[PDB]
Amino acid sequence: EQMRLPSADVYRFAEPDSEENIIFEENMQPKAGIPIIKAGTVIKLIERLTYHMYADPNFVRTFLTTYRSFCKPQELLSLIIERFEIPEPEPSAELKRFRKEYIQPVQLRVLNVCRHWVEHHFYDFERDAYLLQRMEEFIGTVRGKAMKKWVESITKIIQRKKIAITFQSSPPTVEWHISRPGHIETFDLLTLHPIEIARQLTLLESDLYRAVQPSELVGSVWTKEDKEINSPNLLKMIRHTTNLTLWFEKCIVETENLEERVAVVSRIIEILQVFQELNNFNGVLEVVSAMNSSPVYRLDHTFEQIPSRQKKILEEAHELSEDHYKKYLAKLRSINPPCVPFFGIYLTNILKTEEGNPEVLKRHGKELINFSKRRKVAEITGEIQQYQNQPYCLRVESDIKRFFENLNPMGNSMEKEFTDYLFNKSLEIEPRNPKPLPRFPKKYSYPLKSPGVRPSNPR
Amino acid sequence: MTEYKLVVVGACGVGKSALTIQLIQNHFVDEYDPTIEDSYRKQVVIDGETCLLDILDTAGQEEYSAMRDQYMRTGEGFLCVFAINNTKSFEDIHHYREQIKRVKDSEDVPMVLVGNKSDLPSRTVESRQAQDLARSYGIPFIETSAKTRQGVDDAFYTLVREIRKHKE
Numbered sequence: 001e002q003m004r005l006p007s008a009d010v011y012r013f014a015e016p017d018s019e020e021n022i023i024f025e026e027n028m029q030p031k032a033g034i035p036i037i038k039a040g041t042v043i044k045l046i047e048r049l050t051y052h053m054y055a056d057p058n059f060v061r062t063f064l065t066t067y068r069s070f071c072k073p074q075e076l077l078s079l080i081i082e083r084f085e086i087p088e089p090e091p092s093a094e095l096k097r098f099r100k101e102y103i104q105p106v107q108l109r110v111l112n113v114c115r116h117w118v119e120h121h122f123y124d125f126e127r128d129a130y131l132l133q134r135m136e137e138f139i140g141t142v143r144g145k146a147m148k149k150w151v152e153s154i155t156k157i158i159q160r161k162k163i164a165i166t167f168q169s170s171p172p173t174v175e176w177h178i179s180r181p182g183h184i185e186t187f188d189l190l191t192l193h194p195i196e197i198a199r200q201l202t203l204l205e206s207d208l209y210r211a212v213q214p215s216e217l218v219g220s221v222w223t224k225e226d227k228e229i230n231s232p233n234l235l236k237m238i239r240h241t242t243n244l245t246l247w248f249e250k251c252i253v254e255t256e257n258l259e260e261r262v263a264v265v266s267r268i269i270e271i272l273q274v275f276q277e278l279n280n281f282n283g284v285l286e287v288v289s290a291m292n293s294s295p296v297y298r299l300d301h302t303f304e305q306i307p308s309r310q311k312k313i314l315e316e317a318h319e320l321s322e323d324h325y326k327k328y329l330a331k332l333r334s335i336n337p338p339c340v341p342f343f344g345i346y347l348t349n350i351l352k353t354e355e356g357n358p359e360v361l362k363r364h365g366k367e368l369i370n371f372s373k374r375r376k377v378a379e380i381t382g383e384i385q386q387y388q389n390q391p392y393c394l395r396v397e398s399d400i401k402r403f404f405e406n407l408n409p410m411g412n413s414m415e416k417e418f419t420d421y422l423f424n425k426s427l428e429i430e431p432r433n434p435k436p437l438p439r440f441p442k443k444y445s446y447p448l449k450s451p452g453v454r455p456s457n458p459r
Numbered sequence: 460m461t462e463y464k465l466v467v468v469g470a471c472g473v474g475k476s477a478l479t480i481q482l483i484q485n486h487f488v489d490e491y492d493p494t495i496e497d498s499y500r501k502q503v504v505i506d507g508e509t510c511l512l513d514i515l516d517t518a519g520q521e522e523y524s525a526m527r528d529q530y531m532r533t534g535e536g537f538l539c540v541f542a543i544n545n546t547k548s549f550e551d552i553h554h555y556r557e558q559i560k561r562v563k564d565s566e567d568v569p570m571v572l573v574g575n576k577s578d579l580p581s582r583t584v585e586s587r588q589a590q591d592l593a594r595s596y597g598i599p600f601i602e603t604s605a606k607t608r609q610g611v612d613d614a615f616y617t618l619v620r621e622i623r624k625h626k627e
C-alpha cells in the first residue's frame with residue numbers, strides 16, 4: 001500500500017518524482033544506504049531535505065553549506081514553511097497513518113533543518129535581520145507536543161547566537177637564544193631561537209587557518225570584487241603567508257656578506273625543519289616560496305656553502321610542490337592533526353569545481369539544479385574543517401607573537417617597487433657572470449652559530 | 460613521447476580556469492573533477508606529432524603573490540591571459556611577461572597572449588589593441604570564447620609550436 005498525499009495543486013511537494021524533476025547518481029550514500037541526488041528542481045531538493053521516509057544528515061549539511069548559489073535565504077525559509085504546512089487529503093484509518101508517517105516526520109525534519117541552519121550558518125541571520133524575524137515568528141507558531149523539545153532547543157540556540165586556551169598536559173618549555181625575554185627590541189631572525197620562531201609562527205598560522213569559514217569560500221567569493229567583505233579571514237591568512245615569504249627573502253638579500261648570508265639561509269632551513277616536525281605545511285611552503293623566488297634562487301654562491309644536510313632538507317621540501325603537489329597531498333593524507341595545511345590547493349579546487357560544471361542540467365526541456373557540483377564543493381570545505389578542530393600543544397609567547405604579527409617587510413612600498421628592490425639587491429650581492437663576486441662587510445655583531453633544532457632542556 | 464609543461468598566468472576574474480578546463484574536457488561533456496591526475500594532463504596530436512600537455516593553472520591563488528616565481532619556474536611555455544571585458548587585466552600583462560622573463564632568466568621565453576571572452580559586461584579591449592601589444596613583444600595573439608570553445612585549441616597548440624621553434 002502506497003500513501004495518498006494531497007493534490008499538487010494544493011501542496012507542491014506532492015508532485016511525484018520523474019526524470020523531469022529529480023535524478024540520481026548510479027551509487028549509494030556511504031554509511032547510510034540512501035540514494036545520491038545528482039540534480040533536481042528546488043521543490044524536489046527541498047522535499048528530500050525534509051523527506052518523510054528517513055533522515056539525511058549528509059544532504060542537510062551539504063545543502064545548507066551551498067544553497068545560496070541557487071536559492072536566496074528568504075526563499076529557502078518560505079519553502080520550508082510551505083513544506084511544513086501540510087494539508088490533509090480530502091475524503092480515520094489512512095488519516096491516522098498519514099499524520100503519523102507523513103506529517104509528523106516531515107514537520108520534525110523541517111525543524112531539524114531550522115536547527116542546523118541557525119546552529120551552523122547563523123551568518124544568514126546576522127546579515128538579514130528580517131530573516132531572523134520570520135524564523136522567530138514561524139518557530140513561535142509551531143504547535144505539537146512532539147515538537148516542543150526541538151522548538152525550545154532552536155530558541156535557546158538563537159539566544160546563544162545573538163550574544164557577543166590551556167592544554168591536555170604540559171607544553172614544551174619556550175626556547176631562547178640570544179634575545180632575552182622582554183627584550184623585544186633585539187628580536188630578529190638570528191637572535192630568536194629557531195625552534196621558537198617556528199613554534200610561534202605555527203601558532204599564528206594555525207589560528208589563521210582555523211578562522212576561515214565556508215561562507216568565505218563557497219561561490220568563489222574570495223576572487224570577486226567584494227572579496228574583502230566576504231572573505232576577510234581567508235585574506236588575512238594569505239597576507240600573513242605572503243608577508244612571511246617576503247620577510248625571508250628580505251633577510252636573505254639584505255645580508256650582503258656571503259658568510260652571514262649563508263648563516264641566514266641556513267637558519268631559515270632550520271625553521272623549515274621545525275615546521276615540518278610540526279606538520280605546518282603552510283610554514284613549509286612559505287620557506288619554499290622564498291627559496292624559489294627570483295631574487296633568492298639565483299644565489300649560487302650562497303647555495304654552494306649550505307651544509308649538505310640542509311641542502312637535502314630544502315630539496316626534499318621543494319619536492320613536495322612538484323608535479324602539482326603530488327607528494328604534499330600524499331603526506332597530508334597520511335598525517336594526523338594538529339597540522340596547518342596549505343590553503344591554495346583548496347582554493348583552486350573549489351574555483352575549478354564551480355567554473356567547470358554547469359549550474360543547471362536540462363532534462364526533457366526542464367531545468368534542474370546541479371546538486372552534485374555543490375556536493376563536490378562541500379566535500380572540499382569539509383576536508384578544510386577536519387584540520388580545524390585540533391589545536392597545537394604549544395605555549396604562546398606574546399612578545400614573539402607580536403613581533404611576527406607586526407612584521408612589515410614591504411614598509412610603505414608597493415609590490416612592484418619592493419620586489420624590484422629585492423631583485424636589484426640580489427644582483428648587487430651576487431652579480432651575473434661574468435662579473436666577479438664582490439666582498440661586503442659584516443652587519444651582525446653577535447655570533448652566527450645556530451643553537452640547533454633540538455630542545456635545550458628535558459620534558 | 461615529448462611532454463610540454465605549460466603554465467597559465469593572468470588576473471583573477473578572467474576565466475583562466477575555463478580556458479584550461481575547456482582544453483582538457485571532452486568537446487561534449489561539461490564535467491570536471493580537478494582533484495584527479497587526468498585533470499591537468501592531455502595527450503594530443505599537433506602538426507602530426509603526438510605529445511603530452513601538462514598544464515598548470517593556479518586560478519584562485521592570485522593573492523599568494525610571492526608564490527608566482529615558484530609556479531612560473533615550473534613552465535617551459537606560458538599563456539598570458541586577460542579578459543576582453545576587463546581593461547585592467549589587459550594592462551597587467553606587461554607585468555606578467557616581465558616576471559616570466561626574470562624567472563626563466565631569458566629575453567625569449569615561449570609565450571602567447573590570450574584574450575578570453577566569457578559573458579557580460581561587454582568588450583573593452585579591441586582585438587586590434589591586443590594584436591599591437593603581442594606584436595611589440597614578438598609573440599602570437601589568440602582570442603578565445605570560454606563558452607563556445609572557439610579558439611581554445613588554437614591557443615594551446617600555438618604555444619606548443621612556439622616551444623618547438625624555440626628549441627630548434
Ligand SMILES: CCOC(=O)c1cc(C(C)(C)C)oc1CN
Binds near residue numbers: 265288298303314
Ligand atoms: C639559497 C639559494 O637558493 C638556491 O640557490 C636554490 C634553491 C633551490 C631549491 C629551493 C629549488 C631547492 O635550488 C637552488 C639552486 N640555485
